Amino acid sequence: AMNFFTSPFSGIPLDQQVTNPNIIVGKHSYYSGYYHGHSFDDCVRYLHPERDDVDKLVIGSFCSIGSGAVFMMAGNQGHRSDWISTFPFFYQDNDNFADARDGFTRSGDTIIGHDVWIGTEAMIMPGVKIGHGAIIASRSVVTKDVAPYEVVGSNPAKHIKFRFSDVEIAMLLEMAWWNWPESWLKESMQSLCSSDIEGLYLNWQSKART
Template sequence: MRKNPFKHWTEIQYLKEEIKNPLIEVGDYSYYSGYYAGGKFEDICVRYIWGDEESQKMYNPVNDYGWVVDKIKIGKYCCLASGIVFMMGGNQNHNTNWITVYPFKKKLIESYKSKGDTIVGNDVWIGSEAMVMPGIKIGDGAIVASRSVVTRDVEPYTIVGGNPAKFIKKRFTEAQIEMLLEMRWWDWKEEDINNAIDILSSTDIGELYKYYKENIK
C-alpha cells in the first residue's frame, strides 16, 4: 500500500520543491493539496507522461524515436486540489485516423502524435478530481469546478464546470480582466506582493490598479 505523504487534509505541498519529472514545470508558490488522493502530485495527478524513473530506464522517446514529448507547464500561485488529473502522453499511441486504435507493437512509433503542451496559467484554481485533457491551455485567474472534464481551452478569469466543462461565468468585467492581465501581480517582487496582500484579498481591482500604477509600473 502506498504511504500517504500528506499527514492531514490541510497540508499542502509546494510543487516547485517536489517536482522531479523533467517534463513538468511549476512556478513559485503553486501548491497541491493531495491528502484525499493519498499520493504525490507526480504519481497521482500526471498520467501517461514519460520521465518517471522506470520509464527512463526502459527507453527515451525523444532520442530513440524522435517524438515531440508533451510537457505540462503550471504558472505561479496556482491552487490544485486533491485528485486532479492531467492526461498527458499525446494520443497515447491510439491513432483515431486508423481503422484500429489498437497500438500494435510494430506500429508504436508511427502511431504516436503529440497533442501539444498542457499549460496552466497563474493564479488558477482547479477543484478536486477535475480532469484536464492533453494540450489544453487554462488562462490566468481561471477556476475549474470539481470533477469537471476540461476538453477545450479556458479563457483567463473564467469559471468552467461539468463534463465536458462548459462556460459558467466570467469572474470580473472585461475591463477589470484587462487590468488584471496588464498588472500580472504574480510577477511582482515578493515585497510588493506582500505590501498589496490586503488589496489582493479584496474585491477592489481599481485600488490594486492604483497601487500598480504608483508602485510597480
C-alpha cells in the first residue's frame, strides 16, 4: 500500500525513516503516522535537504510524536509582512519581477528536547524551542517556546500546567536519565514507570556522584 505504517498502533523510530540531513534525531524517539500515511520526512515541511545555511530541526531522544504532527521550516517562506506586499516576487518566475528582493528570513532552528510528547496533528511553528519533558496537546499550534516539563495546548498554544514541582523539575534536569548508560536505563525501567522522582534522584545521586 501507500501507507508507510502497517498498523494504527505501529510506532517506528525516527532514525529508521529520516533521510533529510537537516533533521537531527536522537535514539528511541518514534513517529506513529498510520493515519496520515507518510513517513516522518514529510512531517517536516519546506526543509531543503541540501543546504547548510537554513534552519534545522533537532529532536532529542525518547520523544513520542503522534500522527500527522507538522514541523514548519523555511522561516517566513519568503513572505515579508512588513514589506508592501507579502507576494514572493523573488520566487515566482516572471520577467516583470526581475528587480525583486529576496524576502526569505530564517527563524532559527527548531529544537525539541528529550522525552517530549507531541500530540497528533500539532503544528510547531518555525524557530520554536521545546524543553525536555514537555507535552504538546493534540492539535496545538505552538508559536512560542515551551519550558521543560510544561504542558501546552490550543491555537495558539498556551500554558496548561507543569507536570511536576519546580524542585522535581530541577532534579530531573540534573540527573538527565536519557543520557544514562544503557545498563543504568535497563535497571531503571520500573522507576521510570512511576511518579517516584525523589527516589530515583537519590538513587542516581549515590551511584553517579562523588
